[PDB]
């Protein structure tokens, strides 16, 4: 399909391999579940960009194998005393000393924020939701990053959406969330 071609042209090889790895784990084929494949790559890219905007302020948890992800979380919990999350989060903020859950949505940021908060129920893990429309929602409206870094993320996401549009893939994608 066009979707795999788009994914391999707009995402970096590492991200693509990571996303394919995740999918091969669940039991899903990136050539059938093409919209899921794109969402995994998009969310991975956002996580990595978030981390790279940080002396390293953020520890990346997402994109690691579960064994290693929970090793990182456990080490952080034992050195900081911060409580252990029930679900693997996406980053850890050493400056603000808190785990962060990153959401990327094709819907309205508030619907997805409510969904993530209801899902985690761990009042400690900070939530940051980004849209493909340049909108964001974050716990206590603490957006953590500076304006330019958040702007770079927003620009990239809008750019992915428009690349999908030029290829007639956006409509399927936004209805597949
Ligand atoms: O495993 C994680 O840690 C994780 N998993 C997801 C996630 C869940 C379902 C789909 C899906 N799309 N279509 N059908 N199912 C896609 C994603 C994706 F964003 F990863 F792509 C979201 C997170 O935010 C997160 O942190
Ligand atoms: Mn995650
Ligand atoms: Mn996430």
PDB file of C-alpha atoms and ligand atoms in Angstrom, residues 43 47 62 88-90 101, ligand 2:
ATOM      1  CA  UNK A  43       3.954   8.613  18.599  1.00  0.00           C
ATOM      2  CA  UNK A  47       8.417  10.858  22.244  1.00  0.00           C
ATOM      3  CA  UNK A  62       8.933   4.296  25.247  1.00  0.00           C
ATOM      4  CA  UNK A  88       4.698   1.949  31.427  1.00  0.00           C
ATOM      5  CA  UNK A  89       4.868   5.718  30.827  1.00  0.00           C
ATOM      6  CA  UNK A  90       6.718   7.398  27.959  1.00  0.00           C
ATOM      7  CA  UNK A 101       2.574  10.136  29.346  1.00  0.00           C
TER       8      UNK A 101
HETATM    9 MN1  LIG B   2       4.076   4.494  25.850  1.00  0.00          MN
END
